[PDB]
Every structure is written in structure tokens, then in C-alpha cells.
Amino acid sequence: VLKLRLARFGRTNAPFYNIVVAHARTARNSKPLEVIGTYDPVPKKDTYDTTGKLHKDIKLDVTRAKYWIGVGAQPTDTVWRLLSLVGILDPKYKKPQP
Amino acid sequence: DSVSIPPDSPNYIKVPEPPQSSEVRHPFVKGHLPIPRSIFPKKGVPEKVQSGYVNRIAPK
Amino acid sequence: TIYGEVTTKVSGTIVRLNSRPPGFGLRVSHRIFEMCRAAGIRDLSAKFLRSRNPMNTVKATYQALLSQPNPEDLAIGRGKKLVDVRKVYYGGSVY
Amino acid sequence: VQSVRRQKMFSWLDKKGSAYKEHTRQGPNLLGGQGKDGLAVPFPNNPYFKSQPVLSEGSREIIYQDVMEKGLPIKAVSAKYNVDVRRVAAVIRLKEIEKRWIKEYKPLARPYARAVMKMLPQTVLGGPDQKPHESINDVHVHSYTTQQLFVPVSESREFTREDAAKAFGDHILPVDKKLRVPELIEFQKDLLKEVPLQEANRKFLNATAASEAKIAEREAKRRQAVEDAITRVKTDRFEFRFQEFNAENVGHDGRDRNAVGWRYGVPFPDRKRSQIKIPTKVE
Amino acid sequence: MKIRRLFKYHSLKKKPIRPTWNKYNLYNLATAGREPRISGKTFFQQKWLAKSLTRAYHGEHIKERKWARMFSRRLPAVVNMDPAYMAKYNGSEQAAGRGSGLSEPPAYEKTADEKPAKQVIANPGRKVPTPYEQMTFAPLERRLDIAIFRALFASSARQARQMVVHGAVTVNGKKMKHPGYLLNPGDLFQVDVERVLYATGAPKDKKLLAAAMKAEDNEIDPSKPYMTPWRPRNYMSAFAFIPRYLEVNQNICAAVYLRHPVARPGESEVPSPFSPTINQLAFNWYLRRG
Amino acid sequence: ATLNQVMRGCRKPQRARHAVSPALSSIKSPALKGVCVKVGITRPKKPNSGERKTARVRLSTGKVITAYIPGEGHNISQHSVVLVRGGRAQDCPGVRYHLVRGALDLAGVATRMSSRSKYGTKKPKKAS
RNA sequence: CAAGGCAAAUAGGUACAGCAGUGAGGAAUCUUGGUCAAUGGGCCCACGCCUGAACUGGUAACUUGGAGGAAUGAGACGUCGAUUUAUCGAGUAAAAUUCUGUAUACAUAUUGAUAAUGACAAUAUGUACAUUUGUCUUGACUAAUUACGUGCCAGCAGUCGCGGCAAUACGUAAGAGACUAGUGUUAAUCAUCAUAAAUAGGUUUAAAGGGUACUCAGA
RNA sequence: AUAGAUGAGUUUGGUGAUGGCUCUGAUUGAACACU
Ligand SMILES: [K+]
Ligand SMILES: [K+]
Ligand SMILES: [K+]
Ligand SMILES: [Mg+2]
Ligand SMILES: [Mg+2]
Ligand SMILES: [Mg+2]
Ligand SMILES: [Mg+2]
Ligand SMILES: [Mg+2]
Ligand SMILES: [Mg+2]
Ligand SMILES: [Mg+2]
Ligand SMILES: [Mg+2]
Ligand SMILES: [Mg+2]
Ligand SMILES: [Mg+2]
Ligand SMILES: [Mg+2]
Ligand SMILES: [Mg+2]
Ligand SMILES: [Mg+2]
Ligand SMILES: [Mg+2]
Ligand SMILES: [Mg+2]
Ligand SMILES: [Mg+2]
Ligand SMILES: [Mg+2]
């Protein structure tokens, strides 16, 4: 079962993730089939900006990710959300309005 | 670019260096990445990129 | 620096001197450092191949500095120029 | 009781070293004194290091008022006053900060500026141009060009700089292309033909002015192409920036310097000596 | 904690030259021997002497183990080329003769005839030796704590370091708390004005202020660290030089790291109070730390 | 040697050189614990003269070696557990090992002021 | 299925080379913690449950990186150490004065995470504090000296070596050289070593030409 | 990646060679001693 998931890398209190295409039943950090992108959870701030806004830098190969989703790849709950923001899949969870 | 580059950053006035004016030695990066496989043959146009390939394997 | 490479042998003591680009320094032994530093040489490399006799190493080194290939004589012998690329590139010798 | 060593110190410090207590005369007052080139030497044992002049407080304004108001290209201002293009760009950046401080009603260090500027030699630009500030045609000594090569060629060959570049290497360029203001060569080639002076200046401005447009056009398309690969999706809290990249550019064996990812087959180098852990670039 | 190596920083017996504006340092610098004795000393004894002399000044606050890896055998240099020569000649005349150039008569024959020979075609000032030896300690000029001391913002390399560690410097408009940050060509480091005035200002001894407040020009303010009105240090004129690689602005106390120190034919840009003979021996030591 | 002679494997490794402390060099150990079997005196060689304090120790591995007792005065005797380290007494044949003075049973020189680390002696603790 | 160890009797289990931990061996290597909040996996229509993987806290200078304080400081006409008794040092060193607020402590905010869920911590800002020296070396190689004691004795030593009554080499005292929260020693690896030489060696007298050349294989 | 190639002590009445040993450089998942 192919899956688009995250591989945690980095140091203590410094998480850094790697979007990968790996079989479900394999180690989390084993060499996958491909590395689609990277993900950084800790949000950053622009250098010369004082508005206080924050952003999350994400590198993603949308072209390669779309092909694997079309053949039956199952993205995890975390990667599903990211793909939704880009506009590839529909949101899995939404804030209840009532 | 919502915030204009202030005069503090070095990108305020860009003056490119002339060719072959530096010899910075990049350190050898250790490690490798998994070579992404190839989806098409090396020669010829495959059938996957034709008119109705997707509509033939994933019909409604 | 010296002209090209030189190799002299004095009774089992072979010395090999090499010309190095500017800024290389005197990456040589202690005895070769004194001679080069006293003659005016600033960039050079030397190796003792066979023996390291304190005496014959000096006789060989001093004999190698006097056996440098003269570029002007080599040119007249072959009938061809021996243009030094570094002098034409910068339009004059850069000491 | 003071020791003899201290006694000899204060004595020297009261008669010979007293001229350095307070700065009365304008200009350098170093120990090495003036050299054969008219430049003060701070350390007598090192005759090579000299106290080079610094742009005057007014000269900095002349450069600023020229690039901003008159809108002349930095290359023309550099060649006009013989100031390095890297220095002209820095003077404008520092001057822009002054305008900010003066605009924000911040107290300038005028007492520290006037007192220090009297200790350093200066070169006022404009009318009184006694000497050029520095060398604007300094070329980097490429390691390939440092080799001693005596190439055998025919007795009657016209060995030019182009031929010398190929001898050092096939990818090396001659010194005619490594200049920061390569338009000066073309300007000098017009004088050899006895072209009217101020007409050659006209071509120089157009040449330099046109060269800046090309540079500004290149960086414009670049920055425009860098933001086209970023997809900014606004959310409740943050703004996610999805950057696109070809994941297949990992070389022929997976090893590539410009590849994106955390390399799998590497352990932590934190225990290695000389492992720099400081920010390398404040962007 | 004062280590055993700082016990006699400004000794008048050893006579070490330190990177500071102390009056004791000014005496050791002014009365330094013109020529160190290397007559009977061996090669190791020569290298050790030069190492101790140069290290007392260059990066004195840097561990010997750290500088050994910082040392670079690559010494940057540049060559000046005027466009006038480039336009007229293309470098062919330099190869005339047999490749090296057209030979000229010896010196004992030229003036013998009242007429001098025609000038040799070449760039102006194209026979001066370039001082590569003085660039041995160039990498140290890239640190953030050294650059502040070379811009006349601090009275010492140590005092310049605290400005960085204590969060008073701002590189590229961003706080930098690392005195080891290697400045890049184009970086703009800015020190706090209040700390620059105290470092370079004169000492504030209150006994003289007793009869100062009662009995453009500045006003007397008794609520500031430096002595008011601000005046330069007692011996700042003897160490008042700014290197050509740095462009400074005294008003806002900001400077720019234009480029790295490069050796030019006839001069160097690394401030070093030592002759090429000593800088040469220091270079040889660090080649193999022996 | 011709190229064909090098194909057949003529470049064999140089003969091994006996280590200074084979008992330690063999198992890649910096030190070894042992029980003293005899504490005596050894006579130096031709040029030197005197009496070197040596101890016949049986290492944990099983081998019996002759170690050297550095310093002035020792408190070890038969059936004493002492630590052994590499070295050698250059003027005593067979003595190819030393004994750490701050070891388990061997005590460091009490009246030592110079190079205390070499002899396992604590600081005098006078002003402390 | 069989055997031995442990356990078991009419039983027929167990093997911690799963995590933490104990004993043993050894010169020598850790906590019988918290949580599934993050990431990954298994089951599940869904909700959800489980996860000693994993994420986090703890221990150990084992290693690396950083901090561990800067400026002023001249007659306290004091103190000490030597010794030519008046010369040379400790010494800008100290005290003292003027500033900073680094590790860190506390406080606030943000953040790791969002549909929701925070075990624990990071980051930013504000205020506040100026806290140790230690170790080796000193004949040459190899940077750095005298005095006293001992007298081929006691001891030093990586190599050569030192000590036999006026020892710069041993043991003390002082000075000097150097590294520094590390410093030496021991063990090991690479290089030094062209010191197994493919690149690139050599074999008359120094390690090394076979007793001989016809000759298959092979060059 | 174009700067990267280095020696020193020790055999002899003495000289020049041959030839080992040790030192100088870097390091360890290290141990011990003094801290
Ligand atoms: K030899
Ligand atoms: K011997
Ligand atoms: K024979
Ligand atoms: Mg002592
Ligand atoms: Mg078991
Ligand atoms: Mg276990
Ligand atoms: Mg045990
Ligand atoms: Mg979980
Ligand atoms: Mg959960
Ligand atoms: Mg999950
Ligand atoms: Mg579910
Ligand atoms: Mg703090
Ligand atoms: Mg010595
Ligand atoms: Mg000793
Ligand atoms: Mg001998
Ligand atoms: Mg002694
Ligand atoms: Mg440390
Ligand atoms: Mg036979
Ligand atoms: Mg025979
Ligand atoms: Mg004989």
C-alpha cells in the first residue's frame, strides 16, 4: 500500500519532516521510493517584516504528488490536509459551524 | 513582496560580481536520496499520454 | 620562484625543487628555507628523495638553483617561442 | 616606588608620546609617519599597511545626490570619482539609514563623527580632485592564472590575451571581461580614434545606463519567477507557502548539492570538530 | 575567570602588542625592536618566536586549536589593470623576442649614453612585489568582533566581543549575538551608539565633575557613562586607521563589509604590526603546526 | 618485480613488529587489572646501575607479566590487586609494563609535589 | 520433534541478542520516568482502542559548539621576592573607580496542532546577578632557569641518555614556556615510511639472481 | 577543488651510504590519573 507520508528528521526540539512515497508497512525513516518534498512545522517570520504574521515554508512537487494520488496512493491525515490547501484533495475535517 | 527591501539588507542595491571573481569551495554533502523511478520508456511515445488514456482506465 | 623543476644528485642525496604559484610560500625544509629566504625566493616546494645528509643536501640545492632551465636558450635551440602565459595575461610581469 | 621600566614609560609618554594625547592637527598622526607615497603608516615595522583615506562627510552626499537625484548609473559614478562600485552602493545604504534616523528624530553621533574624521585622511570629491580614491579596475587573481606556463609557439606568433586565457584553461576569460566597469575599455578605444571627448562621454553614459537596465531586467524576471513557484494559501493562523520543485533533480546517483530533502544515509555530525553551528547568512 | 594566560596582558618586560588602545600597549608598540634576532636560532626556534609575537595581537581571544583550522593557505590578491593599455595593446608585445619579451641593455650601458631608451610597453606600476606574507591572519578580519574593532567602534577586540555577546550589534538589520559570525561581502553591521561613545569616549571620573556643572557644542550631562562633553580617548589618535575593505559611517555608527582583505602589489589590507620576516615564519608554523 | 609477478600476489604484508606491551596491544586494551604474584627487585643493564622495583602480575586474561613500580615507595605485596598500563623499563629486560600509582590497591606517593597526576597524588590541601 | 539449564507432576511452561533494570565478566559505557500531544504503523462502517517503535525528561566533560567580563587604574611614596645592597622583578598586577547584564533565574507572549487533542520543551521580549582555575613541561630532539639536597644510591626516561661529593636531566623551592574545563598518560588507526614501490623500489662488494637451459601453460 | 607534495633524533675513530626504530601531524563509541 503506497502512502504519501512524513518522515521525521532533525534534532531534539527541532522537528523537520520529509514528504515521501513509501509502502505502508515499513520503517518511518527507511529509504523510500521518492522524496516528494519537505515540511517544517515551526512557523517562521519574514526578516524585515514587523506585522507579526507567520508562515510555514513547504516544498512540494505537486506534479509528482498528483501522479501517485491518481494510482491509489493513500496520504496520511497530515499530508491530506497539506494537499487540500494546495487544492488536490477535499478537506477531510472542517470546523463545525453550528 | 509585501514589504519593500530596506536599506539594511544587501539586496537594496544589487551589483552582480564579474565572472570568475571568487573561488568558494562548497563542502562535500554527505548522504544520498532515493532515485525517483521513471514512469515512461526511454524511447518512443508511450500510450499513457494519449487522448483518452485516463478515461479508459478510470471510467466514470 | 625558480624556473620550472630541477633535480640534482650529490652522492646519494637527490634534491627536487619545484616552482609554485605566488602566495604558495616556502613549504620546504629548514636548510632550504634559509637559502631561499637569503637569495630572494618566496614560493617553492622541495623534496629529498633518497638521502638527507645535512651537507650534500645543501650542495645539491645550491647546485639546482644554478641549473635552472633557461627559457631563452631552450627557445633558440628549438626555433620556437616559449611565451610565458602569465605575463601576457596581465600585460606585464606581476612580481 | 615605580620600577625603572614604568619610569622609562611615563618619561617617553610625557615628552615623545605626548603628541598623541589630544588630536590638534587635522589628518593622521600615527607613529610610522608619512611614507614615500604620502600615506601615514600606523605600524612602523610594517611599511606595507597604510592608513588609506576615507570619503569626506560631504563627499558621501555628492555620491548620494548623484545616484538618487540625477539618477546616473552606479558604474558612471564609480568611474567619475574613481570609487569602487561596491563602495558606492554601501555609501547609499548607509546614507539611507541616516535619512531614516533624521526622519525619526534620532540623535546622531555627531561629536564622535567629527572627532574621528579628523584622525583619518580624507579625499574630498568634486572640484578639488587631487588624487583618485582607489583602484576601480582591480581584477581577482584566479588560481588558474597563477601557474607558470611557457607554451611553445611559432617564432612569429601574435600571442594575445585571448590565447593566454585558453592556455590557462578552456573556460577562463581574459582580463578584458573580469572588470567591474567593462565600458571603460570601449571608452578608451574611442579616444584612440580621436573621437570628440564629450561625445565619448555620451556613449559611456548610454553604455553604462543600458547595462544597468539589463541587470535590473534579469533580477526582475528572476524574482518574478521565484514567486511564481510559491503558492501562498492563507489560513486561520498562518500563510502556508507551497514551493514547487522538480523532485527528479537528484543527480545520477541520488547525490546532488542542490537537491531538496534530508539525506537518509548520514549520521549526526554534531560531534565533529569544527562543526559550525552559527547562522551562516543573515538574509 | 582570569586564565593563567592573561596574567600579564600588557607587560613591559615581555613587551606584547595587543589589539587595544591602552597607553601601556602604545609604549610597547612604539618601542618595539626593529629587527628580531634570528641569527643563531634554529628553524623551529624562529617559527615559535614569530608565532608567539603574532598571536599576541591577531585573534588573541581565540583558542590555538580553533585558529589552526581557521588558517587558510589560500591568500587572496588582486591586480590593477588600466583600460588605456587594454585598448591600445592586446598583450602581443609582451611575447616579442623569445616569449619572455624584448630584451633591454644592461644598467651599466643605459645612462652611459646621454639619451634614454624608449619606454617599455606595459601597465603602470607592473613590477612591484605583492606582500602575500602579510595576509597570514586575513581570515580573522572576517569575524564580527574583529570588524567592530577595525571600524573604530571599540577600544579593543575584547570590548568589541561583549558588544556582540550582550546583544548590541545588528547585522543586516537583525540582532546578532555571535562574535564568530563570518561577515559576508555586503553585510552591514551596526553597533549601538550608546556603547560606542563609552568605549571610545574618555573615562568618567567624578572628581572632575564636582567643579564642572556649576562653573555644534554639547551640554554637560551627569547622567551618562562617558564624561560629558564627549571627547575621544586619550590615545585614540595613534590607532586611528580604517581598512579599505570596510566602509564606515561615524554618524549612525554603522559599517559595511565590502569584500575580503586582498593583497595588492605594494600594500596589504590586514593590520599587522610585524614585518614580512615574522609573518613568513608564522605562516610556516601553521602549515603543519610544527 | 614485473607486472605478472604482482598479479600472483608478490606484495605481501611486512613482517609484524613486536609491540611494547603485547598483553595490552593484542586485545586493544589501554590497561588491565592483575593480582601481584611477586614483588621484588630487578637489576639494570650494562650502563645503568641500581635496583628497580618490579612486580610479577597475573593479568585478568591469564598471562603473567613483569610490571614496573614508578615513584618512591610502594605499599603492594603478595596478593594485591593493581592496575597495569603499557610502557617499559628501558634498562630492565622483560619489564614491559607499568603500574598506575592511583590504582585499586597501589597508593600514590604521599610526599609528591611535582607531576602529581603521573603518580596519583591528591593536592596537598594546605590553603583549602 | 529432540537434548541440556530453570520451572513443573501428571505437568508439559520458560530462554530480555524487545525497553528499563539486576548479577556476572571487564580498563570501560546510562533511567526499573512521562506521553501517544507530534510523526509512523495495526484493528475499526464510524467513533475509537493499542503502540518500550517514536516523541520527550533523567544520568556520564565521552565528544563537539557556545558562554565563562570589558575599560580605567603614576609617584599604596605600601607589601613580597631575589640580590650586585643597590640594582633587577612580582606589577597595571592588585585594591579602587566607571559600565555592560553573557550562561542562568524569574515573568509575559507566541509556537511545536490542529477538525479537535500539548507529555515536554523551544523561541522572542522584559527585569535581575560579574561565579573556580587546573594540568604538563623545562639536557638534546622540543618552546622554557637558577639555588639547595641526594651521590651509579634514591630515581628519571617517547629516542639518544642522566646520577660515581662543586647534577641546567633525579627529589624539593622559585622562575620561565605552553594548553585550559580541561591537561597529561596508556592502547589503537592514518600519515611520517618510495618501510611490500600497480602509479613507484631493489638484488657485484650492504637483506635479495634459482646449479644448468631445453621446454607445456602463461607473459 | 589549480596548491597539494616538506622533515627531525639515533649505528662510525671519523666520512659517505644502506636500513630499521623513535619523535613532529591528525584522530577515537576510548580507559586511567590529577582536576
Ligand atoms: K635511507
Ligand atoms: K640502550
Ligand atoms: K648464479
Ligand atoms: Mg613548579
Ligand atoms: Mg540470552
Ligand atoms: Mg536490555
Ligand atoms: Mg567487575
Ligand atoms: Mg500516536
Ligand atoms: Mg490521539
Ligand atoms: Mg496515527
Ligand atoms: Mg477512523
Ligand atoms: Mg539572558
Ligand atoms: Mg631549547
Ligand atoms: Mg619528571
Ligand atoms: Mg649512541
Ligand atoms: Mg628535576
Ligand atoms: Mg568545551
Ligand atoms: Mg635447487
Ligand atoms: Mg645456492
Ligand atoms: Mg671502523
From Swiss-Prot, chain B:
Top-level taxon in the UniProt lineage: Eukaryota
Coiled coil: none
Compartments where found: Mitochondrion
Region (Disordered): 1-25
Subunit structure: Component of the mitochondrial small ribosomal subunit (mt-SSU). Mature N.crassa 74S mitochondrial ribosomes consist of a small (37S) and a large (54S) subunit. The 37S small subunit contains a 16S ribosomal RNA (16S mt-rRNA) and 32 different proteins. The 54S large subunit contains a 23S rRNA (23S mt-rRNA) and 42 different proteins.
Physiological role: Component of the mitochondrial ribosome (mitoribosome), a dedicated translation machinery responsible for the synthesis of mitochondrial genome-encoded proteins, including at least some of the essential transmembrane subunits of the mitochondrial respiratory chain. The mitoribosomes are attached to the mitochondrial inner membrane and translation products are cotranslationally integrated into the membrane.
Family in the record: Belongs to the mitochondrion-specific ribosomal protein mS26 family.
Listed name of the protein: Small ribosomal subunit protein mS26
Organism for this UniProt entry: Neurospora crassa (strain ATCC 24698 / 74-OR23-1A / CBS 708.71 / DSM 1257 / FGSC 987)
Gene name linked to the record: pet123
Stretch of the intact protein here: 47 to 106 of 316
Curated annotation (Swiss-Prot), chain D:
Keyword annotations: Mitochondrion
MF (Gene Ontology): structural constituent of ribosome
Oligomer status and interactors: Component of the mitochondrial small ribosomal subunit (mt-SSU). Mature N.crassa 74S mitochondrial ribosomes consist of a small (37S) and a large (54S) subunit. The 37S small subunit contains a 16S ribosomal RNA (16S mt-rRNA) and 32 different proteins. The 54S large subunit contains a 23S rRNA (23S mt-rRNA) and 42 different proteins.
Protein name per its UniProtKB record: Small ribosomal subunit protein mS45
Cellular-component GO terms for this entry: mitochondrial small ribosomal subunit
Primary residence: mitochondrion
Keyword Heme: no
Gene Ontology biological-process entries: mitochondrial translation
Organism: Neurospora crassa (strain ATCC 24698 / 74-OR23-1A / CBS 708.71 / DSM 1257 / FGSC 987)
Cellular location(s): Mitochondrion
TM segment ranges: none
The UniProt record lists the keyword Mitochondrion: yes
Function in brief: Component of the mitochondrial ribosome (mitoribosome), a dedicated translation machinery responsible for the synthesis of mitochondrial genome-encoded proteins, including at least some of the essential transmembrane subunits of the mitochondrial respiratory chain. The mitoribosomes are attached to the mitochondrial inner membrane and translation products are cotranslationally integrated into the membrane.
Organism lineage: Eukaryota, Fungi, Dikarya, Ascomycota, Pezizomycotina
Full-sequence range covered: 66 to 348 of 348
Family: Belongs to the mitochondrion-specific ribosomal protein mS45 family.
